[PDB]
């Protein structure tokens, strides 16, 4: 439920929205929040962000060196579980090509969805305060009491005659 500015999954810029409803949006669904929380966590190289030297991933250790596939998978699979709301990891297809020296892995992560605790900070309210009456209706009655009775009588006259 971690709120934050929404990042476009397709381009990487802020998700200002479609041309018909351009604006700014907050990440509300846990899925969207977790997506960007993993994306930033994996995209920032370790130590390259000032104000926090411990954040990021240490790509320099592996890239450019002769490395064992098994060691890399452990670190990749470990960084994911640093988020407190990750249920499990389903599958992991780690493959390496020696000709091009490229490495490419696949996997998915499962996360549940929570409640909103309070709507005070977001948009709307859930209550239905009453509406003041109109004109002399309060002190003298209402005509609808006649209309509903007339309709009931008419429908009952309709019911008895077979159709």
């Amino acid at each position: 439920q971690f709120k934050d500015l929404l990042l476009d999954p397709l381009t990487g810029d802020l998700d200002f929205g479609t041309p018909g409803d351009r604006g700014m949006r907050l990440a509300l669904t846990n899925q969207l929040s977790l997506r960007q929380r993993l994306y930033l966590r994996f995209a920032i190289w370790a130590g390259d962000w000032y104000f926090d030297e411990t954040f990021g991933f240490p790509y320099r250790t592996f890239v450019g060196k002769k490395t064992v596939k098994a060691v890399l998978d452990g670190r990749i699979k470990s960084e994911v579980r640093q988020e407190p709301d990750v249920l499990q990891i389903t599958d992991f297809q780690s493959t390496m090509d020696v000709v091009s020296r490229s490495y490419k892995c696949f996997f998915t992560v499962v996360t549940a969805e929570g409640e909103e605790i309070s709507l005070a900070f977001v948009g709307e309210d859930e209550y239905q305060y009453p509406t003041p009456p109109e004109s002399n209706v309060q002190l003298c009655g209402d005509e609808g009491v006649i209309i509903n009775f007339k309709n009931k009588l008419y429908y009952l006259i309709n019911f008895r005659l077979p159709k």
Binding site: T11, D13, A43, I44, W45, D48, G56
Partner: protein
């Protein structure tokens, strides 16, 4: 090798801060940059005006609207003086506080009002002194009262002004 006065506009303020984008993650997305640039460039204007708030308050460059405030603290009121010469009187009176009215000293004060060769001074036996002006750039009658003040208690003075030799 370096200026002692550190009060200067910060060089290349805008490109700084952008340097703190971690690993070019957002660079080239043209959506986050504009949002950040729009906010940062506002500080540019404020950063620039921080200098004039200090630079313009100096007596050398102070405009008449506020130069009066500087003069007011020193007791030198505008009276009927105009801006270009009001600056001069402020300098002259202030400089008088560390003077002795010697021949070498008098030449120095007149030096700031008429360039290098614009003034000369003849001397006489019985307290007579003379002032010559060649390249005046301001009207002298209003400046005259001060020109008397920085002279000995018993000076006898003549004033003659002309353009060129």
């Amino acid at each position: 090798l370096k200026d002692v006065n550190h009060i200067h506009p910060l060089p290349d303020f805008v490109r700084g801060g952008f340097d703190y984008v971690p690993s070019d993650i957002f660079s080239g997305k043209e959506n986050f940059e504009q949002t950040l640039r729009i906010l940062l460039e506002r500080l540019e204007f404020i950063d620039q005006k921080m200098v004039e708030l200090a630079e313009l308050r100096t007596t050398l460059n102070a405009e008449d609207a506020i130069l009066d405030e500087i003069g007011r603290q020193l007791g030198i009121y505008r009276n009927g003086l105009n801006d270009p010469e009001y600056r001069a009187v402020i300098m002259i009176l202030t400089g008088n506080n560390s003077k002795s009215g010697t021949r070498a000293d008098i030449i120095a004060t007149l030096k700031q009002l008429f360039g290098e060769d614009g003034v000369t001074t003849y001397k006489g036996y019985n307290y007579r002194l003379d002032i010559n002006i060649f390249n005046t750039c301001m009207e002298v009658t209003d400046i005259l009262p001060e020109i008397i003040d920085m002279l000995p208690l018993v000076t006898h003075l003549r004033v003659v002004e002309n353009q060129g030799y």
